[PDB]
Amino acid sequence: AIGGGAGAKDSILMNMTNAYLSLWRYFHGDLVFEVNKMSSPYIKSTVTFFIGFGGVSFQPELEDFPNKLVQFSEVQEKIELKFTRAEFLTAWSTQVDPAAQLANDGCPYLYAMVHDSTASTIVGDFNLGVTLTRIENFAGIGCNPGIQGARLLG
């Protein structure tokens, strides 16, 4: 539910693409994400990306969803992964009130879990940057009256 902007300390952050997306009430399409590696290449991990719902508590039998395994090489820096619109049943809301509970949120999520442990010899952490670049096959439905507030990133 990426509309409404980004949260900040009694503030919101906006740009013209999110403001253009937040005009409609629901949207639907197949999403194209780009994952960048922001750490040293001596820190290695295998990350599974999938589409879920609500709040899960790391069940080991969670890879039964159609998931994508990402494992970076040393020369590999950025990887594009496309979730087709067969993973989404109907459209979902562009904006969700941030004061709602986890059970009272119907929008899908993007989950990333470590398939194995994080192995390195340096004392750093494994950093990734996710960017939703484009939404192909875009379908907008309705008109948004607006919801004040936005959630924090990261």
């Binding site: 509309g3 902007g5 919101i12 906006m14 740009n15 013209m16 403001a19 253009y20 937040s22 005009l23 948004n144 009256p145 607006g146 004040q148």
Partner: peptide, 14 residues
């Protein structure tokens, strides 16, 4: 000044 999406689009566009 409210934070409606019409006002946000009219502000944050060039």
């Amino acid at each position: 000044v409210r934070n409606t999406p019409v006002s946000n689009l009219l502000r944050t566009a060039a």
